[PDB]
Design a protein that fits this description.
Chain D: GO terms for molecular function: G-protein beta-subunit binding. The complex is a heteropentamer. Chain C is an all-beta fold. In chain C, 0% of the residues lie in helices and 42% in strands. Chain D is elongated. The chains are: A alpha/beta, B mainly beta, C mainly beta, D mainly alpha, E mainly alpha. The complex binds cholesterol and the ligand CC(=O)OC[C@@H](O)COP(=O)(O)OCC[N+](C)(C)C (2 copies).
C-alpha cells in the first residue's frame, strides 16, 4: 500500500544502515591514539620515525597511520591551534590512549610539563583515558648528569633527600646518578597519576629516546593492555 | 597610561548607566503573569545509526530533514517524519563538530578541528556527494557556522575571530576580530544583518555583517560561553555559560533581562535554544538531562531525563512541532 | 563583570618579605580554584602555587615550595600571597589566575597572555 | 599599540541608543501573548495534527 | 527388568524441580534481557548468553512434566508422542548448556588473552553462525534416542520414558559418548580457557590486586559449579554403562543406585539456577541495569 517513493526511501535507509555498520566494524578494528607534548618534546621526530618505520600551512590536525603486528594505529597530532587547550581537548574523550612526550632533560620546563600532565589527568572528560608517558631525550639528561654542570636540586629540592629504590633493578651499564634521577622523575609522575586515578585510569611510565626504534613495540603493548582492561569489564569479568 | 585611564573611565560610566537604568530586578514586573502549566514533553522516535558523539545539528526550512555531525567523521540527514536516512557524507577529518542546513537545502557546511570549512551539495545531478567548496584561511578550529544566504556563509573559528565567506569566490568577504577567548556559538537575527557571537571570555559581542565592526558587547556570564540563541523577535538573545546559569539580554537595553540558575545544578549549559514563541527555554546539561525553563518566570517547566550520556546539541523546529536533542551516546531523541 | 584586581608589591631589599592581595568581584570566589603564576622578563610564564576551592588542599612549585604561603578568605573574597626571603631570581610579574570552570580541580591558567580570568599583574622587582 | 583599538571600540559603546527597560518589557510581553497561541509546545496540539 | 524402588524418589526430585523452576523463571528472563541488551551493543558475548538463556527456559518449560512424574511414584500418564519429544529436550538441553558455557569461555579467552587478534571471530554474525552449528550438532547427534521408543513398563508399578535401567548395548555406547564428548571435553576446554584468562590477568601489571583476586574467585566458582552440578549424574551413568558392558542384562546394579540416579538427575537441574546468576546477576553493571529496569 505504501508509495513507490516510500519504498525507495526504506531501501536507501537500509543500504545506509548497512554501510554505517561496515564503517563501524572498520572503525572498531583500528585503534586511534592522541599524541601530545611540549615544544621541546620532539613530537616531529617521533612521528617521522613512526611514519618511515611502520608505514596547506593552516592544517590543524596531522594524522599518521602505522601498523604494528597487523594492528592499525591512527595517531593524531595537533598543529595550528591556539595554546588554549581547555576546549578542543574534550573531543579526545574516546581515544584508547594518550601518548604524552615529556622532555626530562629540560628542568626549567619539567614542572610546567608536570602541571600540564596533572591537568590532563584530572580533567573530567579524560579520566577514562590511560596516558602513555614517554620521557624522551634521555641522552641529554644522561650527559648533563655525567657532566654535573646542572643540579636537579635547584628545581626539585626533594632530589637531595631521595634514595634509589632497592626493589628496582638499575641498568648495569647506566650511571647510578642517571638512574636515580630518572626514577625520581618517574616517581613524581606516578604519584601524580595515582593521587586520583584508580579502577579506570592507569598511567604507563617508560624511558625512551628519539633515536630508539622500538617505541612502536611499547605503544602496541600498551594498547594491548588497555584493550585487555576494557574487555575485562565489557565481557562481565570485572 | 592615558589609554588605560580612558578605558577605565568609559567602563565606569557604562556601569553607572546600567545601574541607573536597572533600578530593580525585571522579575518583579514580569511576576504579574500567571504560572505556566506543566509541559511534560515525551519522546516520540529515538534515532540510532551514529557511531560516535553527536556535536552539531540544525533543522531545515522544510522542518523534515535535519543534519547531524558525528565525531567519527560523518554527516547524516535524518528524516523526522520517517527516521529514514537520506544522505550520509563521510568526511576526511573525523573530528567534525559543526554542521548546518541551508535555508534552501542546496548546500551544507561543516567543520572540525581542521581550519578548513567543507561545503557539499545534496542535489548533485550525478547523485554522488562531492566537496563543492573548501574554505581555507582560518587559524583555529571551526566552532560553529550558521547559514544566512545561499551565496555567503558566516562561520566562527577557534582563533577568537569570525569570518564571512562568499561561496562564489571562496574568499573571506570580511572578518570580525576582538574576542579574547575562542568563539563557541553563533546565532543570526531574522534579518540576517546582525549576529551575536559568544567566546570563552564570558562576553558576547554583537556585530553587523555589512558594517564589519563590533556593535555591542554583553558581559554578565561568570564563565565561558557555550551556547547562544536569538529570541524570535530578534531584539534579545539567551546564553548558556559554564557557570551553570543562563542569561537573557536585550540588544537595545544592553542589560540582563532574566537569569536562570539553581543550587542543584553544578554543571554547564552545553546547548541553548528558543522555541517559536520564545516562552520556553531549553538547555542541555552535562548531567545527562535536559531542562525547560520559563522565559518569563524561570520555572522548571519540564525535565527530559531520558539520555545515556552528555547532551551536546539541542534544537527546536522552525514551526516548533518537535525538539531534537543529540548526546555523546550517539543517539538523537525527538520530543514533543 | 569578572574583575580580578591585584594590589601590593614594590621594591624590597634581598632577604625581605612581601604580601600581594588579590581582590575578586563579579563571581563566587569559593566555587573556583585559585592559582598564582609568575612571568620573569625575557622568559615564559611559570606556575607558583594554587589553592583549592575550600582551601583544604594547597600545592606549591618546587622553586618556592615551603617558602611562599597561599591563603584565601571567602568573607571578603580576597586572596593573599606572602613571599619570604626574596632573591633577584624572583623578580617577575605575578598574576592571580582563576580556574576556567567551577567544581573542577584542573586549571589551565598558565596561558601566554590570552587567559581571560587572569588579572593585570603586579611587578615585583629586587 | 593594541589598546588603541580597544578604546576605539569602547567609545562606540557609549553611542548606543539606549531604551527604557519598561518599553522593551512591554513589547516582549505583547509578543509572547500574541504568539503564545501559535506555539505547539506551549499548547500541545491534538495528536491527530501531530506528525509524530 | 528389575525391582528398583525407593522412598526418596517422590520427595527430593520434585521439590528440587519446583525450586529450580521458581528461581529460574525470575532470573532466566532477566538474563535473556541482559543478553539482548548486550547484543544491541554488538557484544558477541550476548548471543551466547541469549542462547544459553533460551536453552535454560526450554529446560524449565520441560521440567514440570517430570514434576508430575515424581508427584505420583514412577509412572508416565502422557502419550508416547509427548515424552518422545520432552525426553529429548530434557536430556539434550543439559549438553547444549555445557556447549554454550564452553563457547562463552572461549570467547572471553579470545577477548582477554588476545585482545587485538581474532577480530573476525568476535562478531555477532560469527557468534550466530557458531550458535547455529552448536544447535544443529546437539539436536541431531543426541537424536539417536529418538530412533527408539519409550514406556518401558515392568512390574512394581513402574513405567519409564528413557529410564530403561535394563538398558541396551546401544544405550550404553550412547552413554559413553555422552560422558566423554558432551561433558568432559567442554569442561576441559572451559578450564583451559579460564586458566588462560587468569594467566593473561596475572601477566597484566595494570590490573589491581582486588580485581585480580575477584577474577580468580569468579573463574574458580564457574569451574567448580559445573562439576558440582554435572559430575554426580555422570559418574553414576558411566558406572551403569560399564557394568552393563561387562555384565549385560545383570540388573543387580540399579538395585543399589536407583535412588542415586534420580537424585543426581534432579541435582543436575540446579545448574539452570546457577548459570544465570553467575553470568548476569553477580556482575555489578548487569545487576545494576536489571535492578533499574525492574524498578522503572
Ligand atoms: C548445592 C550446590 C550449589 C553446592 C555447591 C557450592 C558452591 C557455591 C561452591 C562449591 C565449590 C566452591 C568454590 C571452591 C573454591 C573456590 C576458590 C576460592 O579461592 C574462592 C571460592 C571458590 C571459587 C568456591 C566458591 C563456591 C563454590 C563454587
Ligand atoms: C566460541 C568458539 O570458539 O566455539 C567453540 C565451540 O563452538 C566448540 O563447540 P563444541 O564443544 O565442539 O560443540 C559440541 C558440544 N558438545 C561437546 C557435544 C556438548
Ligand atoms: C574449538 C577448538 O577446537 O579449539 C578450542 C581451543 O583452541 C581453545 O583454546 P584454549 O583451550 O582456551 O587454550 C588455552 C591455553 N592456555 C591455557 C593459554 C595455555
Amino acid at each position: 500500500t505504501l508509495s513507490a517513493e516510500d519504498k525507495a526511501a526504506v531501501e536507501r535507509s537500509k543500504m545506509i544502515e548497512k554501510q554505517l555498520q561496515k564503517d563501524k566494524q572498520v572503525y572498531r578494528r583500528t585503534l586511534r591514539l592522541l599524541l601530545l607534548g611540549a615544544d621541546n618534546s620532539g613530537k616531529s621526530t617521533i612521528v617521522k620515525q613512526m611514519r618511515i618505520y611502520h608505514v596547506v600551512k593552516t592544517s590543524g590536525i596531522f594524522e599518521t597511520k602505522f601498523q604494528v603486528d597487523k594492528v592499525n594505529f591512527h595517531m593524531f597530532d595537533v598543529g595550528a591551534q591556539r595554546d588554549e587547550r581547555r576546549k578542543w581537548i574534550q573531543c579526545f574523550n574516546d581515544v584508547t590512549a594518550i601518548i604524552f612526550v615529556v622532555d626530562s632533560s629540560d628542568y626549567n620546563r619539567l614542572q610546567e610539563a608536570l602541571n600540564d600532565f596533572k591537568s590532563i589527568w584530572n580533567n573530567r572528560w579524560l579520566r577514562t583515558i590511560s596516558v602513555i608517558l614517554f620521557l624522551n631525550k634521555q641522552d641529554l639528561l644522561a650527559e648533563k648528569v655525567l657532566a654535573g654542570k646542572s643540579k636537579i636540586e635547584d628545581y626539585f629540592p626533594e632530589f637531595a633527600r631521595y634514595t634509589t629504590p632497592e626493589d628496582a633493578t638499575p641498568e648495569p651499564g647506566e650511571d647510578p646518578r642517571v638512574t636515580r634521577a630518572k626514577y625520581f622523575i618517574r616517581k613524581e609522575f606516578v604519584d601524580i597519576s595515582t593521587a586520583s586515578g584508580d579502577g579506570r585510569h592507569i598511567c604507563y611510565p617508560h624511558f625512551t629516546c628519539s633515536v630508539d626504534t622500538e617505541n612502536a613495540r611499547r605503544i602496541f603493548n600498551d594498547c594491548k593492555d588497555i584493550i585487555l582492561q576494557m574487555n575485562l569489564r565489557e565481557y562481565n569479568l570485572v | 597610561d592615558q589609554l588605560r585611564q580612558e578605558a577605565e573611565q568609559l567602563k565606569n560610566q557604562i556601569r553607572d548607566a546600567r545601574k541607573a537604568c536597572a533600578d530593580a530586578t525585571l522579575s518583579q514586573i514580569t511576576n504579574n503573569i500567571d504560572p505556566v502549566g506543566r509541559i511534560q514533553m515525551r519522546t516520540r522516535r529515538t534515532l540510532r545509526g551514529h557511531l560516535a558523539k553527536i556535536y552539531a545539528m540544525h533543522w531545515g526550512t522544510d522542518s523534515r530533514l535535519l543534519v547531524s555531525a558525528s565525531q567519527d567523521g560523518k554527516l547524516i540527514i535524518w528524516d523526522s517524519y520517517t527516521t529514514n536516512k537520506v544522505h550520509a557524507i563521510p568526511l576526511r577529518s573525523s573530528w567534525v563538530m559543526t554542521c548546518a542546513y541551508a535555508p534552501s537545502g542546496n548546500y551544507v557546511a561543516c567543520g572540525g578541528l581542521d581550519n578548513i570549512c567543507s561545503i557539499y551539495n545534496l542535489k548533485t545531478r550525478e547523485g554522488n556527494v562531492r566537496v563543492s567548496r573548501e574554505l581555507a584561511g582560518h587559524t583555529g578550529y571551526l566552532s560553529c557556522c550558521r547559514f544566512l544566504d545561499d551565496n555567503q556563509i558566516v562561520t566562527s573559528s577557534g582563533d577568537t575571530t569570525c569570518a564571512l565567506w562568499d561561496i562564489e569566490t571562496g574568499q573571506q568577504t570580511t572578518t570580525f576580530t576582538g574576542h579574547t577567548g575562542d568563539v563557541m556559538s553563533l546565532s543570526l537575527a531574522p534579518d540576517t544583518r546582525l549576529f551575536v557571537s559568544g567566546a570563552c571570555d564570558a562576553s558576547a559581542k554583537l556585530w553587523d555583517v555589512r558594517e564589519g565592526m563590533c556593535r555591542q558587547t554583553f558581559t554578565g556570564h561568570e564563565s565561558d560561553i557555550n551556547a547562544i540563541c536569538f529570541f524570535p523577535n530578534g531584539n534579545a538573545f539567551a546564553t548558556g555559560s559554564d557557570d551553570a546559569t543562563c542569561r537573557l539580554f536585550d540588544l537595545r537595553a544592553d542589560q540582563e533581562l532574566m537569569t536562570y540558575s539553581h543550587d542543584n545544578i553544578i554543571c554547564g549549559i552545553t546547548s541553548v535554544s528558543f522555541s517559536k514563541s520564545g516562552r520556553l527555554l531549553l538547555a542541555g546539561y552535562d548531567d545527562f538531562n535536559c531542562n525547560v525553563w520559563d522565559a518569563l518566570k524561570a520555572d522548571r517547566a519540564g525535565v527530559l531525563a531520558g539520555h545515556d550520556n552528555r547532551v551536546s546539541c539541542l534544537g527546536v523546529t522552525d514551526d516548533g512541532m518537535a525538539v531534537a536533542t543529540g548526546s555523546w551516546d550517539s543517539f538523537l531523541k525527538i520530543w514533543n | 563583570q569578572v574583575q580580578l584586581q591585584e594590589s601590593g608589591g614594590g621594591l624590597v631589599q634581598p632577604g625581605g618579605s612581601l604580601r600581594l592581595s588579590c581582590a575578586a568581584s563579579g563571581f563566587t570566589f569559593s566555587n573556583y580554584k585559585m592559582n598564582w603564576v609568575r612571568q620573569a622578563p625575557g622568559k615564559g610564564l611559570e606556575w607558583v602555587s594554587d589553592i583549592s576551592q575550600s582551601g583544604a588542599s594547597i600545592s606549591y612549585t618546587g622553586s618556592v615550595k615551603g617558602r611562599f604561603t597561599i591563603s584565601r578568605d571567602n568573607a571578603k573574597n580576597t586572596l593573599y600571597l606572602q613571599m619570604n626571603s626574596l632573591k633577584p631570581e624572583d623578580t617577575a610579574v605575578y598574576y592571580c589566575a582563576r580556574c576556567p570552570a567551577p567544581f573542577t580541580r584542573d586549571c589551565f591558567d598558565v596561558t601566554s597572555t590570552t587567559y581571560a580570568y587572569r588579572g593585570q599583574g603586579t611587578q615585583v622587582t629586587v | 599599540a593594541q589598546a588603541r583599538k580597544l578604546v576605539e571600540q569602547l567609545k562606540m559603546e557609549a553611542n548606543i541608543d539606549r531604551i527604557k527597560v519598561s518599553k522593551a518589557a512591554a513589547d516582549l510581553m505583547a509578543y509572547c501573548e500574541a504568539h503564545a497561541k501559535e506555539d505547539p509546545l506551549l499548547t500541545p496540539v491534538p495528536a491527530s495534527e501531530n506528525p509524530f | 527388568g528389575c525391582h528398583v524402588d525407593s522412598r526418596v524418589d517422590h520427595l527430593f526430585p520434585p521439590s528440587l524441580y519446583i525450586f529450580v523452576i521458581g528461581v529460574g523463571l525470575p532470573t532466566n528472563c532477566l538474563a535473556l534481557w541482559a543478553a539482548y541488551r548486550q547484543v544491541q551493543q554488538r557484544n558477541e558475548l550476548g548471543v551466547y548468553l541469549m542462547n544459553l538463556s533460551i536453552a535454560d527456559l526450554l529446560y524449565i518449560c520441560t521440567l514440570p512434566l517430570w514434576v508430575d512424574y515424581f508427584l505420583h511414584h514412577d509412572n508416565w500418564i502422557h502419550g508416547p508422542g509427548s515424552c518422545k519429544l520432552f525426553g529429548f529436550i530434557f536430556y539434550t538441553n543439559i549438553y547444549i548448556s555445557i556447549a554454550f558455557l564452553c563457547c562463552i569461555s572461549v570467547d572471553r579467552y579470545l577477548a582477554v588473552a588476545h585482545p587485538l587478534r581474532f577480530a573476525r571471530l568476535r562478531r555477532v554474525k560469527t557468534a550466530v553462525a557458531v550458535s547455529s552449528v552448536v544447535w544443529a550438532t546437539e539436536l541431531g547427534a543426541n537424536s539417536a534416542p529418538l530412533f527408539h521408543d519409550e514406556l518401558f513398563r515392568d512390574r512394581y508399578n513402574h513405567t519409564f520414558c528413557f529410564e530403561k535401567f535394563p538398558m541396551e548395548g546401544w544405550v550404553a555406547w550412547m552413554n559413553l559418548y555422552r560422558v566423554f564428548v558432551g561433558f568432559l571435553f567442554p569442561w576441559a576446554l572451559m578450564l583451559l580457557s579460564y586458566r588462560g584468562i587468569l594467566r593473561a590477568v596475572r601477566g597484566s601489571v595494570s590490573t589491581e590486586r582486588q580485581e585480580k583476586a575477584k577474577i580468580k574467585r569468579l573463574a574458580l566458582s564457574l569451574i567448580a559449579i559445573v562439576l558440582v552440578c554435572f559430575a554426580p549424574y555422570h559418574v553414576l551413568l558411566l558406572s551403569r554403562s560399564a557394568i552393563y558392558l561387562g555384565r549385560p542384562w545383570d540388573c543387580g546394579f540399579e538395585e543399589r543406585v536407583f535412588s542415586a540416579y534420580h537424585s543426581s538427575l534432579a541435582f543436575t537441574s540446579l545448574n539452570c539456577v546457577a548459570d544465570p546468576i553467575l553470568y548476569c546477576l553477580v556482575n555489578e553493571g548487569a545487576r545494576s541495569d536489571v535492578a533499574k529496569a525492574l524498578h522503572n
